[PDB]
Coordinates of C-alpha atoms in Angstrom, one line a residue:
Chain A
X2 CA -29.8 -26.6 9.8
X3 CA -30.0 -23.1 11.2
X4 CA -27.4 -21.2 9.2
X5 CA -27.3 -17.5 9.9
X6 CA -28.0 -15.0 7.1
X7 CA -24.9 -13.2 5.9
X8 CA -24.9 -9.6 4.9
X9 CA -22.0 -8.8 2.5
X10 CA -21.0 -5.4 1.2
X11 CA -19.3 -4.8 -2.1
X12 CA -21.1 -7.9 -3.3
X13 CA -21.2 -7.0 -7.0
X14 CA -17.7 -8.2 -7.8
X15 CA -14.3 -9.4 -6.6
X16 CA -14.0 -10.6 -3.0
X17 CA -17.6 -9.8 -2.0
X18 CA -19.0 -11.7 -5.0
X19 CA -16.9 -14.7 -4.0
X20 CA -18.0 -14.6 -0.4
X21 CA -21.6 -14.5 -1.6
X22 CA -21.2 -17.6 -3.7
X23 CA -19.3 -19.4 -0.9
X24 CA -21.9 -18.7 1.8
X25 CA -24.8 -19.5 -0.6
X26 CA -23.4 -22.9 -1.4
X27 CA -22.8 -23.6 2.3
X28 CA -26.5 -23.0 2.7
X29 CA -26.6 -19.4 4.1
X30 CA -29.3 -16.9 3.1
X31 CA -27.8 -13.7 1.9
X32 CA -28.3 -10.0 1.9
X33 CA -26.2 -8.6 -0.9
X34 CA -25.1 -4.9 -0.7
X35 CA -23.3 -3.0 -3.5
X36 CA -23.4 0.0 -5.7
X37 CA -23.7 -1.9 -9.0
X38 CA -27.3 -3.2 -8.7
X39 CA -27.2 -4.8 -12.2
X40 CA -24.2 -7.1 -11.5
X41 CA -25.7 -7.9 -8.1
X42 CA -29.1 -9.0 -9.6
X43 CA -27.3 -11.2 -12.2
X44 CA -25.2 -12.9 -9.5
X45 CA -28.0 -13.2 -7.0
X46 CA -30.4 -14.6 -9.6
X47 CA -27.8 -17.3 -10.5
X48 CA -27.2 -18.2 -6.9
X49 CA -30.9 -18.5 -6.2
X50 CA -31.2 -20.9 -9.1
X51 CA -28.2 -23.0 -8.1
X52 CA -28.3 -23.0 -4.3
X53 CA -32.1 -22.4 -3.6
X54 CA -31.3 -20.0 -0.8
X55 CA -33.1 -16.7 -0.3
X56 CA -31.1 -13.6 -1.3
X57 CA -32.1 -10.0 -0.7
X58 CA -30.4 -7.4 -2.9
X59 CA -29.8 -3.9 -1.5
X60 CA -28.5 -1.2 -3.8
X61 CA -26.4 1.1 -1.7
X62 CA -23.5 3.6 -2.1
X63 CA -21.9 3.4 1.3
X64 CA -20.4 6.9 0.7
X65 CA -24.0 8.2 0.9
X66 CA -25.7 8.9 4.3
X67 CA -29.1 7.5 3.1
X68 CA -27.6 4.2 1.8
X69 CA -25.5 3.7 4.9
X70 CA -28.4 4.4 7.2
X71 CA -30.5 1.9 5.3
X72 CA -28.0 -0.9 5.7
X73 CA -27.5 -0.1 9.4
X74 CA -31.3 -0.4 9.9
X75 CA -31.3 -3.8 8.1
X76 CA -28.4 -5.0 10.3
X77 CA -30.1 -3.8 13.5
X78 CA -33.6 -5.2 12.9
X79 CA -33.0 -8.4 10.8
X80 CA -32.4 -10.9 13.6
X81 CA -31.6 -13.6 11.0
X82 CA -28.3 -11.8 10.1
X83 CA -25.5 -13.4 12.1
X84 CA -22.6 -12.7 9.8
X85 CA -21.4 -9.3 8.5
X86 CA -18.7 -9.2 5.8
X87 CA -17.3 -5.7 5.8
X88 CA -16.0 -5.9 2.3
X89 CA -17.0 -2.6 0.6
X90 CA -13.9 -0.6 -0.2
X91 CA -12.0 1.4 -2.8
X92 CA -8.4 2.0 -3.7
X93 CA -6.4 5.2 -4.1
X94 CA -5.5 6.4 -7.6
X95 CA -2.3 8.5 -7.8
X96 CA 0.1 10.1 -5.4
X97 CA -1.0 12.1 -2.3
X98 CA -0.5 15.5 -4.0
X99 CA -2.9 14.3 -6.8
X100 CA -5.7 13.7 -4.3
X101 CA -8.9 15.8 -4.0
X102 CA -11.0 16.9 -1.1
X103 CA -13.8 14.8 -2.7
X104 CA -11.5 11.8 -3.2
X105 CA -10.2 12.0 0.4
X106 CA -13.8 12.2 1.8
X107 CA -14.9 9.2 -0.2
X108 CA -11.9 7.0 0.5
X109 CA -12.1 7.5 4.3
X110 CA -15.9 7.2 4.2
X111 CA -16.1 3.9 2.3
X112 CA -13.0 2.2 3.9
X113 CA -13.3 3.5 7.5
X114 CA -16.5 5.2 8.4
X115 CA -18.9 2.8 6.7
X116 CA -17.4 -0.5 8.1
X117 CA -17.2 1.0 11.6
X118 CA -20.8 2.1 11.5
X119 CA -22.0 -1.3 10.1
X120 CA -20.1 -3.1 12.9
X121 CA -21.7 -0.8 15.4
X122 CA -25.2 -1.6 14.0
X123 CA -24.8 -5.3 14.6
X124 CA -22.7 -5.2 17.8
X125 CA -25.6 -4.2 20.0
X126 CA -27.8 -7.0 18.7
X127 CA -24.9 -9.6 18.6
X128 CA -24.1 -8.9 22.2
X129 CA -27.7 -9.4 23.3
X130 CA -27.9 -12.7 21.4
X131 CA -24.4 -13.8 22.6
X132 CA -23.3 -14.8 19.1
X133 CA -22.4 -13.3 15.7
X134 CA -19.5 -12.9 13.3
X135 CA -17.9 -9.7 11.9
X136 CA -15.4 -10.1 9.1
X137 CA -13.4 -6.9 8.2
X138 CA -11.5 -6.9 4.9
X139 CA -8.2 -5.1 5.5
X140 CA -5.1 -5.1 3.4
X141 CA -1.4 -5.9 3.5
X142 CA -0.9 -2.3 2.4
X143 CA -1.8 -1.4 6.0
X144 CA 1.7 -2.6 6.9
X145 CA 3.5 -0.9 4.0
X146 CA 3.7 2.9 3.8
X147 CA 6.6 2.3 1.4
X148 CA 4.0 1.3 -1.3
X149 CA 3.0 4.9 -1.8
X150 CA -0.8 4.4 -1.3
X151 CA -0.8 6.6 1.8
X152 CA -4.5 7.3 2.3
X153 CA -5.6 3.8 1.3
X154 CA -3.0 2.2 3.5
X155 CA -4.0 4.5 6.4
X156 CA -7.7 3.4 6.1
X157 CA -6.5 -0.2 6.2
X158 CA -4.4 0.3 9.3
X159 CA -7.6 1.7 10.8
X160 CA -9.5 -1.5 9.8
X161 CA -6.9 -3.8 11.4
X162 CA -7.0 -1.8 14.6
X163 CA -10.8 -1.8 14.6
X164 CA -10.8 -5.6 14.3
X165 CA -8.3 -6.0 17.1
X166 CA -10.3 -3.6 19.3
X167 CA -13.6 -5.3 18.5
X168 CA -12.3 -8.8 19.3
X169 CA -11.1 -7.6 22.8
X170 CA -14.5 -5.8 23.4
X171 CA -16.9 -8.2 21.8
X172 CA -15.0 -11.5 22.0
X173 CA -16.0 -12.1 25.6
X174 CA -19.6 -11.4 24.6
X175 CA -19.5 -14.4 22.2
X176 CA -18.8 -12.4 19.1
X177 CA -16.2 -13.5 16.5
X178 CA -14.3 -10.6 14.9
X179 CA -12.0 -11.6 12.0
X180 CA -9.6 -9.4 10.1
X181 CA -8.8 -10.7 6.6
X182 CA -5.8 -8.9 5.0
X183 CA -5.3 -9.6 1.3
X184 CA -2.4 -8.5 -0.8
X185 CA -2.7 -8.1 -4.6
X186 CA -5.8 -10.0 -5.7
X187 CA -7.4 -10.5 -9.1
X188 CA -10.7 -8.7 -8.7
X199 CA -1.6 -8.9 -21.7
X200 CA 2.2 -9.1 -21.3
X201 CA 2.4 -9.8 -17.5
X202 CA 1.8 -12.8 -15.1
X203 CA 1.3 -12.2 -11.4
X204 CA -1.4 -11.9 -8.6
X205 CA -3.5 -14.4 -6.5
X206 CA -6.9 -15.6 -7.7
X207 CA -9.8 -14.2 -5.7
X208 CA -11.1 -17.7 -5.2
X209 CA -7.9 -18.8 -3.5
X210 CA -8.0 -15.7 -1.3
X211 CA -11.6 -16.3 -0.1
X212 CA -11.0 -20.0 0.3
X213 CA -8.0 -19.2 2.6
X214 CA -10.1 -16.6 4.4
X215 CA -12.9 -19.1 5.0
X216 CA -10.4 -21.6 6.4
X217 CA -9.4 -19.0 8.9
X218 CA -13.1 -18.2 9.4
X219 CA -14.0 -21.8 10.2
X220 CA -10.9 -22.0 12.5
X221 CA -12.0 -18.8 14.2
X222 CA -8.7 -17.1 13.3
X223 CA -8.6 -13.5 14.5
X224 CA -6.1 -12.1 12.0
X225 CA -5.9 -13.9 8.6
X226 CA -3.2 -13.0 6.1
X227 CA -3.3 -15.6 3.3
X228 CA -0.3 -14.1 1.3
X229 CA 1.9 -14.1 4.4
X230 CA 4.4 -16.9 4.0
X231 CA 5.7 -16.9 7.6
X232 CA 2.9 -16.7 10.1
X233 CA 5.3 -16.1 13.0
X234 CA 6.0 -12.7 11.5
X235 CA 2.6 -11.5 12.6
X236 CA 3.1 -12.8 16.1
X237 CA 6.4 -11.0 16.3
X238 CA 4.8 -7.8 15.1
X239 CA 2.1 -8.0 17.7
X240 CA 4.7 -8.8 20.4
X241 CA 6.8 -5.8 19.2
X242 CA 3.7 -3.6 19.5
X243 CA 3.1 -4.8 23.1
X244 CA 6.8 -4.5 23.8
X245 CA 6.6 -0.8 23.0
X246 CA 3.5 -0.4 25.2
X247 CA 5.3 -2.1 28.1
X248 CA 7.9 0.7 28.1
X249 CA 5.4 3.6 28.1
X250 CA 6.0 5.8 31.2
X251 CA 3.4 8.6 31.1
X252 CA 4.5 10.9 34.0
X253 CA 7.5 12.5 32.2
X254 CA 9.2 12.5 28.9
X255 CA 12.1 10.2 28.4
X256 CA 15.6 11.6 29.2
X257 CA 16.5 11.8 25.5
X258 CA 14.1 14.8 25.4
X259 CA 15.8 16.6 28.3
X260 CA 18.4 19.3 27.8
Chain B
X2 CA 15.3 35.8 10.3
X3 CA 12.1 35.0 8.3
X4 CA 10.4 32.4 10.4
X5 CA 7.3 30.9 8.7
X6 CA 3.8 31.3 10.0
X7 CA 2.4 28.3 11.7
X8 CA -1.3 27.2 11.4
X9 CA -2.5 25.3 14.4
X10 CA -5.8 23.4 14.7
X11 CA -7.4 22.7 18.0
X12 CA -5.6 25.8 19.2
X13 CA -8.2 26.7 21.9
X14 CA -6.8 24.4 24.6
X15 CA -4.4 21.7 25.5
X16 CA -1.7 20.7 23.1
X17 CA -2.8 23.2 20.4
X18 CA -2.7 26.2 22.8
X19 CA 0.7 25.2 24.0
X20 CA 2.1 24.9 20.5
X21 CA 0.8 28.4 19.8
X22 CA 2.5 29.8 22.9
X23 CA 5.8 28.1 22.0
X24 CA 5.9 29.1 18.3
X25 CA 4.9 32.7 19.2
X26 CA 7.8 32.9 21.7
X27 CA 10.1 31.6 19.0
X28 CA 9.0 34.5 16.8
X29 CA 6.5 32.8 14.5
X30 CA 3.3 34.5 13.3
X31 CA 0.3 32.3 14.0
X32 CA -3.0 31.2 12.5
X33 CA -5.1 29.7 15.3
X34 CA -8.0 27.4 14.3
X35 CA -10.6 26.1 16.7
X36 CA -14.3 26.1 17.3
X37 CA -14.1 28.1 20.6
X38 CA -13.5 31.6 19.3
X39 CA -13.9 33.2 22.7
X40 CA -11.1 31.2 24.3
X41 CA -9.0 31.5 21.2
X42 CA -9.2 35.3 21.2
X43 CA -8.3 35.4 24.9
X44 CA -5.2 33.3 24.1
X45 CA -4.3 35.2 21.0
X46 CA -4.6 38.6 22.8
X47 CA -2.2 37.4 25.5
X48 CA 0.3 36.1 23.0
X49 CA 0.2 39.3 21.0
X50 CA 1.1 41.3 24.1
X51 CA 3.9 38.9 25.2
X52 CA 5.6 38.0 21.9
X53 CA 4.4 40.8 19.5
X54 CA 3.7 38.4 16.7
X55 CA 0.6 38.6 14.5
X56 CA -2.1 36.1 15.1
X57 CA -5.1 35.4 12.9
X58 CA -8.0 33.6 14.6
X59 CA -10.2 31.4 12.5
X60 CA -13.4 30.0 14.1
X61 CA -14.0 26.7 12.4
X62 CA -15.7 23.4 13.1
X63 CA -13.5 21.0 11.1
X64 CA -16.2 18.4 11.0
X65 CA -18.2 20.7 8.7
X66 CA -17.5 20.9 4.9
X67 CA -17.8 24.7 4.7
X68 CA -15.4 25.4 7.6
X69 CA -12.9 22.7 6.5
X70 CA -12.9 24.1 2.9
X71 CA -12.1 27.6 4.3
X72 CA -9.1 26.3 6.3
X73 CA -8.0 24.3 3.2
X74 CA -8.2 27.5 1.1
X75 CA -6.2 29.4 3.8
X76 CA -3.5 26.7 3.8
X77 CA -3.4 26.6 0.0
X78 CA -3.3 30.3 -0.7
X79 CA -1.4 31.8 2.3
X80 CA 2.2 31.5 1.2
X81 CA 3.4 32.7 4.6
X82 CA 2.3 29.5 6.3
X83 CA 5.2 27.0 6.4
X84 CA 4.2 24.9 9.4
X85 CA 1.0 22.9 9.8
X86 CA 0.1 21.5 13.3
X87 CA -2.6 18.8 12.7
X88 CA -3.7 18.9 16.3
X89 CA -7.5 19.0 16.2
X90 CA -9.0 15.8 17.6
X91 CA -11.5 14.3 20.0
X92 CA -11.6 11.2 22.2
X93 CA -14.1 8.4 22.3
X94 CA -16.7 8.3 25.1
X95 CA -17.7 4.8 26.2
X96 CA -17.5 1.3 24.8
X97 CA -18.1 0.4 21.1
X98 CA -21.7 -0.7 21.7
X99 CA -22.4 2.7 23.2
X100 CA -21.3 4.6 20.0
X101 CA -23.7 6.4 17.7
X102 CA -23.8 6.9 13.9
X103 CA -23.5 10.6 14.7
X104 CA -20.6 10.0 17.2
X105 CA -18.7 7.7 14.8
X106 CA -19.0 10.2 11.9
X107 CA -17.6 13.0 14.0
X108 CA -14.8 10.9 15.5
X109 CA -13.6 9.7 12.1
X110 CA -14.2 13.1 10.4
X111 CA -12.2 15.2 13.0
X112 CA -9.3 12.7 13.7
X113 CA -8.8 11.3 10.2
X114 CA -10.6 13.1 7.3
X115 CA -9.8 16.7 8.4
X116 CA -6.1 16.2 9.1
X117 CA -5.7 14.3 5.8
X118 CA -7.4 17.1 3.8
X119 CA -5.4 19.8 5.6
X120 CA -2.2 18.0 4.8
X121 CA -3.2 17.8 1.2
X122 CA -4.0 21.5 1.1
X123 CA -0.5 22.4 2.1
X124 CA 1.4 19.7 0.4
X125 CA 0.7 21.0 -3.1
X126 CA 2.1 24.4 -2.2
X127 CA 4.9 23.0 0.0
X128 CA 6.0 20.8 -2.9
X129 CA 6.2 23.8 -5.3
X130 CA 8.2 25.7 -2.7
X131 CA 10.4 22.8 -1.9
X132 CA 10.0 23.2 1.9
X133 CA 7.4 23.0 4.7
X134 CA 6.6 21.1 7.9
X135 CA 3.6 18.9 8.8
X136 CA 3.2 17.9 12.4
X137 CA 0.5 15.2 13.0
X138 CA -0.7 14.6 16.6
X139 CA -1.2 10.9 16.9
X140 CA -1.5 8.9 20.1
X141 CA 0.1 6.0 21.9
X142 CA -3.4 4.5 22.0
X143 CA -2.8 3.7 18.3
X144 CA -0.6 0.9 19.7
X145 CA -3.1 -0.4 22.3
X146 CA -6.3 -2.0 21.3
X147 CA -6.3 -3.3 24.9
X148 CA -7.2 0.1 26.2
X149 CA -10.8 -0.2 25.0
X150 CA -10.9 3.0 22.9
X151 CA -11.3 1.0 19.7
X152 CA -12.5 3.8 17.3
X153 CA -10.3 6.5 18.8
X154 CA -7.2 4.2 18.7
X155 CA -8.1 3.2 15.1
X156 CA -8.1 6.9 14.0
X157 CA -4.7 7.3 15.7
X158 CA -3.4 4.2 13.9
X159 CA -4.6 6.0 10.7
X160 CA -2.7 9.2 11.6
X161 CA 0.6 7.4 12.2
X162 CA 0.3 5.6 8.9
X163 CA -0.5 8.9 7.2
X164 CA 2.6 10.4 8.7
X165 CA 4.8 7.5 7.6
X166 CA 3.3 7.6 4.1
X167 CA 3.7 11.4 3.8
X168 CA 7.4 11.3 4.9
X169 CA 8.3 8.9 2.1
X170 CA 6.2 10.8 -0.4
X171 CA 6.9 14.4 0.5
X172 CA 10.4 14.0 2.2
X173 CA 12.0 13.8 -1.3
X174 CA 10.2 17.1 -2.1
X175 CA 11.8 18.8 0.9
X176 CA 8.8 18.5 3.2
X177 CA 9.2 17.4 6.9
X178 CA 6.5 15.2 8.3
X179 CA 6.6 14.5 12.0
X180 CA 4.4 12.1 14.0
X181 CA 3.9 13.2 17.7
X182 CA 2.4 10.4 19.8
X183 CA 1.4 11.5 23.2
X184 CA 0.1 9.3 26.0
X185 CA -2.1 10.7 28.8
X186 CA -1.5 14.5 28.9
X187 CA -3.0 16.9 31.4
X188 CA -4.7 19.4 29.1
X198 CA -5.6 13.1 44.9
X199 CA -5.8 9.4 45.9
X200 CA -4.1 8.4 42.7
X201 CA -0.4 8.5 41.6
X202 CA 0.3 10.9 38.8
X203 CA 0.8 9.2 35.4
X204 CA -0.3 12.0 33.2
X205 CA 2.3 14.3 31.6
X206 CA 2.1 18.1 31.8
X207 CA 1.1 19.5 28.5
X208 CA 4.1 21.9 28.7
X209 CA 6.5 19.0 29.1
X210 CA 4.9 17.1 26.2
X211 CA 5.1 19.9 23.7
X212 CA 8.6 20.8 24.8
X213 CA 9.7 17.3 24.1
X214 CA 7.8 17.3 20.8
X215 CA 9.6 20.5 19.8
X216 CA 13.0 19.1 20.6
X217 CA 12.2 16.3 18.2
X218 CA 10.8 18.8 15.8
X219 CA 14.1 20.8 15.8
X220 CA 16.1 17.5 15.4
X221 CA 13.8 16.6 12.4
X222 CA 12.7 13.5 14.2
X223 CA 10.2 11.5 12.1
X224 CA 8.3 9.7 14.9
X225 CA 8.4 11.3 18.4
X226 CA 7.0 9.4 21.4
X227 CA 7.9 11.4 24.5
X228 CA 6.5 8.9 27.1
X229 CA 8.4 6.0 25.5
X230 CA 11.2 5.1 27.9
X231 CA 13.1 2.8 25.5
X232 CA 13.5 4.4 22.1
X233 CA 14.7 1.1 20.6
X234 CA 11.1 -0.3 21.0
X235 CA 10.0 1.9 18.1
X236 CA 12.8 0.8 15.9
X237 CA 12.1 -2.8 16.7
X238 CA 8.4 -2.4 15.9
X239 CA 9.1 -0.8 12.6
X240 CA 11.7 -3.5 11.8
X241 CA 9.1 -6.2 12.7
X242 CA 6.6 -4.4 10.4
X243 CA 9.0 -4.5 7.5
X244 CA 10.0 -8.0 8.5
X245 CA 6.3 -9.1 8.0
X246 CA 6.3 -7.4 4.6
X247 CA 9.5 -9.2 3.6
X248 CA 7.6 -12.5 3.8
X249 CA 4.7 -11.4 1.7
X250 CA 4.3 -13.7 -1.3
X251 CA 1.3 -12.7 -3.4
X252 CA 1.1 -15.5 -6.0
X253 CA -0.6 -18.1 -3.7
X254 CA -1.9 -18.5 -0.2
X255 CA 0.5 -20.0 2.4
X256 CA 0.5 -23.8 2.9
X257 CA -1.3 -23.4 6.2
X258 CA -4.3 -22.4 4.2
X259 CA -3.9 -25.3 1.7
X260 CA -5.6 -28.7 2.3

């Protein structure tokens, strides 16, 4: 019974909190990372009592260089960590013209820079060990510029490409890289939205099946294949020596 | 008659330097932004002699908060600037496991954070004026995780999405947002498969003058882009958010 320890960012609520509970019941030791230390301690204390696994709590604001460097160091040196859940992330509030220099910095930093750096911290050790799993939490919005969340969607397009690139680089080294792409998730005079428990349960079914790109709210799985095929179809017609004749006078 | 001033980042060499020469010959005043002030001043001096336009040179490291804030201020306050060429960018050196925390920060900052912030600096004024043009320099690598430049390609996937999002948001305000996606561009025992930077920018400016939204000069079959975008929306058309698909149900 040698289950690897799982480090999970954004563990204080929502998708991260559900991942923590899931892996703890499966028998995995945990390292919980979030900005809200109080909700983490409450959740971690309950999971210790129920599942009897060991859980380390790391308070970290991954928009800060000190906090991000501390989590990187934990990922590099803790040889027991064999699973990274790149879950920490934030949304965009308002239109593009309502955004701030501070808001743009934080949104890219948390959704793009931090998960890339955490993946880099583990990839060197994972490759030497010949095993390891990296789960990046993307978003369906990464496919939908029409939704008006331009910067958030752009960071999620980054996350999907990162996952695809890491699989091709690290897959042959024995490393499993999964992209989980939720839609609207629950993390009144209105009914809608998917329960976070259903989302993580679907994501873990793909995880156990070693699925590379997992989109639970996608009804027709073939649509993803056709998108990837269309992507490669475009690349197959790239001729780099000269511009196409439609750009010639 | 009254051609707007163009601010061009990464103007010291390559695509940025070529955009500068092109817009100066058309009659546009320029604001050149780069870290290499010596090479920029050489270029700007030559363009002043040839085209007789005015050129302001701003030495700036767009990975730095102070320098980026100065260029933001210039874009917000200089009402003569009507064109933004988001060209500043750097490549990735080595595999993912060879990357550094320092290298990752700079790669994301220069290729993603800086162009987004510069676009935001102009968009507020552009929207009030009801006109303006934003040209984001992406890359074909944004379509190709197979090329092994994972972080660089990811930033270019970011830039393309940013361009698509800005067109739908700022287009209705009268703002033109173009995505220019080069492949290998030249900025003896092998066959040439790199495009001359002059040919790349000339193709990009033909798309610019035609108000093309996504311009991929090395793409031989233009329909491939349409089919990709259609497939993208086709995937979105099958998104059902209430429950997970039955393939994830026991």
